Amino acid sequence: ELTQPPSVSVSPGQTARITCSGAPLTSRFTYWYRQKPGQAPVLIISRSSQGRFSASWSGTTVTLTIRGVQADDEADYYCQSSDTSDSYKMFGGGTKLT
């Protein structure tokens, strides 16, 4: 079970961090999504090769750092990568950014 916060909080102007923890993060790169309630989960984090949105790898965790929280970004965020056997994928929880 991917270990995310289901919600995080931040005030008009500050930065924030969402940590998606677990086991397979020491092996596979991490990809993220933005589902505004009922929308199509927008892809924001990729591995284009071996601006305001990024994610820092750290062992059992990969921390999604968000800079510049306009209220336009209130949504459920989902971390998703792959297990160590490269067969199946699955998603974490769904972090409501307040």
Binding site: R28, F29, R47, Q50, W57
Partner: protein, 53 residues
């Protein structure tokens, strides 16, 4: 070319197959002994899985 000549051949015990094997060692040596000897390269190393995902 020779017509009506039946000399008995040998490609295995052929003394030239061994003469050939000896050449690759000396061009080595005479392009080896006058270059950089590297026994200082046996100093302990610190190694790690490289900069990747």
């Amino acid at each position: 070319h020779l017509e009506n000549v039946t000399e008995e051949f040998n490609m295995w015990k052929n003394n030239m197959v061994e003469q050939m094997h000896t050449d690759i060692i000396s061009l080595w040596d005479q392009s080896l002994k006058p270059c950089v000897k590297l026994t200082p390269l046996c100093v302990t190393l610190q190694c790690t899985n490289v900069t990747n995902n």
